[model samples]
Target chain A: STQQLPQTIIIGVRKGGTRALLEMLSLHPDVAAAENEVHFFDWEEHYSQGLGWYLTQMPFSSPHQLTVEKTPAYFTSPKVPERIHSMNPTIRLLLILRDPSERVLSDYTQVLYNHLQKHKPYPPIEDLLMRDGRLNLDYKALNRSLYHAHMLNWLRFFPLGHIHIVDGDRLIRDPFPEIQKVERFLKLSPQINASNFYFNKTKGFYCLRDSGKDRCLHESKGRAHPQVDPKLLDKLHEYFHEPNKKFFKLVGRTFDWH
Target chain B: STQQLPQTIIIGVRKGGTRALLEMLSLHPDVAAAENEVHFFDWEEHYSQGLGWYLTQMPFSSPHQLTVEKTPAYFTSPKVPERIHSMNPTIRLLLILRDPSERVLSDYTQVLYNHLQKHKPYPPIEDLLMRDGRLNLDYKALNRSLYHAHMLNWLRFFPLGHIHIVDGDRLIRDPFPEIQKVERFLKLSPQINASNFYFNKTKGFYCLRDSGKDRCVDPKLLDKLHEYFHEPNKKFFKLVGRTFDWH
Candidate 1:
């Protein structure tokens, strides 16, 4: 009830280079990013602490500075947007839209890297792609296109104008303009120069410079290697096309679906 | 395979001033304290990535710089010592030992303060002190003192020389010596001065300061707080006395 600082919340569509975005935004002198996903509003246990505890998790600095937190799960979480809006209705929202196919691939690789997929013996990625059944319990292939439902839920809380969707693929290709767009949206000074952008070849992504060296700041390590067959990629693209279109329509944007 | 940096592990007996210990350790110049508890080795899901992944979580810094993390649950975890030892046999461990009863009270207060005790109706501190059932989950009251078990676990993995035990009460009363103990343990030059220690009347504890201001803590709470902690401290002292020589 005291004063809710305006939070620039990144509602993630995970694997859409959310980390890269956070890293890039962090380069801006005014932006302070939380190290990990502080799942406060959505996680009831965390939310019960009240806003004081929630604010405590944030970086301590002067007022009017833009504080950004990226908890990707908040996109799919039904209650998060409303809870977040209730705290501060004017909170700026940033969503990174990635290629659904690539997003799913990244998700799979993350799970494998984290060792979540080791327990279950599964057919190769190609075989799983061919089969209609969802191979991974965590990423159900059938529900892969539920981006529309997730978006519709978010719309219930945030006015459409407050949400800004950045094409993840474009952000990776040329991050400067996208980051500038975010800076403009937040009404912060665009002090971060173009030279700050560094393309990380190994991650197949772009990241911000740390100390004259190009490193993946968001992901300290390169992504877990996964054997993604071309056939699987093609088939996954077909599966995601409709949902991607619907997501674009919902967000009022168009992208060249690969 | 890339060479992995060693982690600064906090082997804790929970509620025994471990948080305060960690908070102080975090203020050091050479130490890169982890933002949250990386309970990789203890949790089954996290362990699946194996030691390699656990090492990756550490800050990619030079060997001279200490990249540390704290997971209070490790003290009670039966499997952690062997697991940690197996991963990095040369790793240094920090154990902050507090009086068990005070630790339990702090643990209860922490759980309540953090909203961990969700199911039962929230009880006042007096009610909590009076209830016998409340004492059962008390770490001090438990037969196998979690700190002793955890310390013994570290002994199984690391040489007695590698483990640094800080008395929790002494640390609260005076943090400079405790910090000096840590600096000596890590073999770093003692860069911090005694003037760096600041007394916070709110929490009544002595907190090691950073930039000469802002991070004030409660020294009074810490002084009165010892009454709750002393009994368990005696028990812990007895247990440790039987097993090993405390210098």
Candidate 2:
């Protein structure tokens, strides 16, 4: 069975709580989101394969139920915004944002974890932080947080109302408030809300629940990040300040998170 | 009168104890700092008059002693950095940063006090919380917190050696270490140190010498602050991104 592109996508603020939001939304009976990230837009070879090949990546949902897919990378890619706009102009985008300085550390943490697993030589945090070419800041962890830098691009293609911004901090503390906002944005019925999460103290972050017990995330959510330096944290905080102000300008509100 | 632009300046991280830094440094016989906020770098009219006109703002210090000035506004000015570079690329810049959000609140409070004094219809805390063109925030408060943002621009014109960053919190709690750092940065003789500090209570923040005591730090500070600051404290540490879980 051929499928349509995602009717709704979580265009990420990667490590900005995308996984948790997707998991929470997936609990809704009417929502069918892929369990794994379907990064169809980013890889150059995949684009060459065409839409028929991409359609297979979608979840098989009923006519009325919505089938969704998410690729965290799509939000930062130069080409993906235009590509997705063509795929579904009316598509709803869900973005979860955090204290950008914290998100940059989380982004580095995961990559460092991946390299540690593969037994490869990891790049030093300081060298990358110096804003070298290895990362085109605004495109990588830093640029994505400029938020307005990419928000302008997304707004260029979609109506302001078509986009939804989710605060990553609230999602971690209490999921329902954000879930309620998402349901309203997606036009989904009141299917999932608060009682869905319970704290897991030993693990640190909040965990999802089924009918009763914890439906924890995969084995690693990371207990501590070793790469963060306070000086660098200040630098990133300073770097994002102006761009953050513009991001609020675009979104038309201010949040305490910054 | 022919005058000279500053060879050194203490650019503030506002309310980060710029007063204390200037007060302490002023005690040094060799350092000459302005008593008032000259604000020469930021005021458009003063800047338009050129360096000689601006130099008159300095005090009557000897040629060997350094002439200096400070204005908290200079930290946030877009034009100030490039302009200061033009005057003296080799000039020394001293910056002190505190908890940014706290500094901004203090800034708003001072403005609120002025409104109360003059009987003006000023904004409320909640409205200001919405960040509608605030007291210092509408001017320098917001930008000064982005210390690195301005530093990056200043560094484009000057070498790293010419800059000294002081930790405002440490400057309050234990002034000696930061003072020594400043001495090394400015290449000054270490004339003052911790022995000069006389701890005084009642003020809650650090109280420097010549105005004051044996002071014992309280036992319940941790629990008390947690109860007081509550969410504000939570927000601060969360951004710091690590729970120190201190003793």
Candidate 3:
């Protein structure tokens, strides 16, 4: 009976540590996390199922607890912003994004891993990334990295203040400060602390600690990203330079992203 | 010698009495009007010609006078809002819109008149209005009547307060109050008065007199037009956060 729709959503950038962000945010006593991707807005069939079905996807929470969900596809899907606005215009949004170049690599790596698991052949990153000596914009991964274009669509529906951006790069390098910022943004009491996170030497990443239990991310999340050619990496950075600047201007803040 | 860029623009709805609105605003001595459409934002070639070329198209105005221009295509042009913002972020915009159903007829009539003069054939209103018994959205005139869609694009680039909506239907019925609203929106002294406009029996419309000068739809295919626009008019009204006096 306490099941309620999410007051906040992580409408996101894929491969941007969204799951990790959610798991950490759930550490707060007043946050109820939906343990799965709802995909309600981006998937046509799921959307046609209506809000009654959507409410079923939310986690049960107390009156004081805030229900939160994440669907990484929402940020890139053209129709998602308006769909989300129609649901709750005042809903707060969270977006975690890494450096554009790095995001592209992670994005490609994700598809690569999926292909490998299915025993399907996939083009090498370089082959798919370029065409006749120019960056292949037709590549959906590269297109998603163009944050400003997607941001333009969202701004058309919701004001900038409603959406909060999290630096995925910083989120990994140091998560507590980022999580604290999110807590402030969500208007939640600061229950998460630096003591709640500890760097695991074997995993080479931060692990969460709660109620004397230690939990690390699934091994699959730390997949070895392919080592891209140095020149192509530079080209990726070069292409994103202007786009990143535009994104910064849109959000009215700068992130420590290359 | 003082030919300044327009501080105010009537970025418009083509058949929405934009020309009449511009002329009425010019009745204020502090307003200097551009006598041509200019097409600076909507025309790719004219837009690429740059701001310098645009300034040349503006009328000469004193420093205290507000330079104003009208390009009825600008309101519907997808790229025009961002382009205008780049030119002057604070530029006040005027959009005069009539009952959308009537607008569709006027839009069709304007094109029909053009094609007639050019000795070109055009489709009948009914033929173009419906496609296999559905409202033919492909009709450019009908598409233009979807005011909320165009308004969405403009609002993305400019805040709602920066763009003023003039009720083209109301402006026709009573010009003075509408002009007064424009004056207030533009932050200008209310120099325009009721005496400035008088209904002309000969033209079957109102005409303007600044210091002292005189100036200035359809049928049962009429029922179809009004019926088609009823839903869309409600959507437009909701978008503007207000309703218009139309069926």
Candidate 4:
């Protein structure tokens, strides 16, 4: 009935190519991507929307197919994994990650774009990026530079096998292998063809092929300056290194960080 | 800390034009809209995202400005208003309302859209609409219509004055006046002009003219739909009707 829950979710580390992955998974016949981020589990104020709102966002298809949503903030939500596990003990989770430094840079550009559109004043990107813990501030909180802590929270709830981590860089450079990995993880048939991997330059990422034509699927791109301060990048790397190491040990996977 | 709390939210009444309201409110200087609809208060499973994740969606500028959000489902959520009141007792709320019949129709269209996009089979709109006890089903349970009861839950927690009821029809017909009502409610500005009215045919209603050059609203529907909506509109009229002069 209406209370049937989603069995899969994309708990995101935003700017780690979550948007691109969402676009691809959305192409699959079995998947149902909620149009808006339903932050129900995270924000208590929203609970009023009720379970029906969440279920309604899912595909009305049979219960056997995967019903999923992508909310990037869920990765860091301590309450999400346990809450999800209690609801559906066997639910599968997918996380996409990238170089933390690069992800933060991309996030910074997005904030800048928002500022320009909304006419809100924000600190210069360089100033905001170089300052330690500056990204933690409210307006810039979307920049989850401490990606390791968030991933660790997920491990506490889901078995390592139930969760799949895809390299954001690889997903952009080559998407088929990643898509196949996703398909295999879900035990779904790999009906999606390689033609779906055409790169869209405008989107600054790869997209599914349409009518044998590779069209750019993304409309937004990173706008941060190419040259980041070497000293600050090193500092940022050190800040995340400990948590990342712990994360690798927990997942038993080595993320080759340059 | 991962436990930080959300400062603002938009509890919803589905098909009440919450989406358009959220899109426009996000344009406010002091507000930030979460990219997703955080359904934390309603579903036990989602509570893990915690107050911190919710708060992260609000920008710091919100302290000086109104930080708002709209998740229409919250209107029916049993525990949400108390939970929200506990988090911040002084939070302002915005509720947009439409005639129940039209709201039901819009909700039906959205569900149909989902089915078509997924190639799933769905019953005819008239069948779903005419079903007995269908409108009474708890949407969170049956995933369909139920409005009257849900709104009552919201009233239980929030003071009527603190909760601003925006007329969905009026909002579509003339947005500036509605926006002005919101601004006055929030005590943000009193200088907004009233000449900003224009028709938006694509949306099939009138909208505010932020600039001089935008599409005009359909005049025919604007004049006639009010007549059709008059009686059913009375319920909401009784609620916020006194705020505006309606004959």
Measured against the true structure, the TM-scores of the candidates, in listed sequence, are: 0.47, 0.48, 0.51, 0.48
Residue-level lDDT tens digits of model 4 in A1-258:
233467778888877777677767766776656656778677766545766666666655655567767888788777777767766778888899877767777777777778878988877656765446553444344337666667667777778899888888788678888888998898877777787665432223454664533333333543434467787677667756787787778778887774
Stretches off by above 4 angstroms in model 4 are A1-4, A48-50, A62-64, A131-143, A210-215, A221-226, B1-247
Better of 1 and 3 by TM-score: 3
Candidate 3 lDDT over residue span B124-230, tens digit each: 88888877867777888888988888999998889888999999987776667788889999999988777676656557567877654555634656777788778
> In model 1, which runs have C-alpha deviations exceeding 4 angstroms?
A1-6, A116-123, A126-138, A141-145, A200-204, A210-214, A218-225, A229-231, B1-247
Q: Which segments of model 3 are wrong by more than 4 Å?
A: B1-247
How do the residues A68-180 of candidate 2 rate in per-residue lDDT, one tens digit apiece?
A: 77787887887888888887788888888888777877887788788889998778666767765333464366766677877778878888888899988788778888889
Best to worst by lDDT, what's the order? 3, 2, 1, 4
Q: What's the chain B TM-score of candidate 4? A: 0.73
- lDDT (0-100) at residue B83 of candidate 3? 87
Cand 3, B chain, TM: 0.95
Model 4 / residue B91 / CA error / Å: 72
Per-residue lDDT of candidate 4, residues B1-247 (tens digit): 1222444566666787787777655545545566667776777776567776666654454345555555777876678888887767788888776655456567767888899999899876545432363332333322322344455566677777777777776565446567777767767655444444433435555444444544332444323334434553455446544533332
Question: Ranking by TM-score, best first?
Answer: 3, 2, 4, 1
Q: Which docking band does candidate 3 fall into?
A: incorrect
By lDDT, the better pick of 2 and 4 is: 2
* Index of the highest-lDDT prediction: 3
Model 2: runs farther than 4 Å from truth? Answer: A1-4, A131-139, A227-229, B1-247
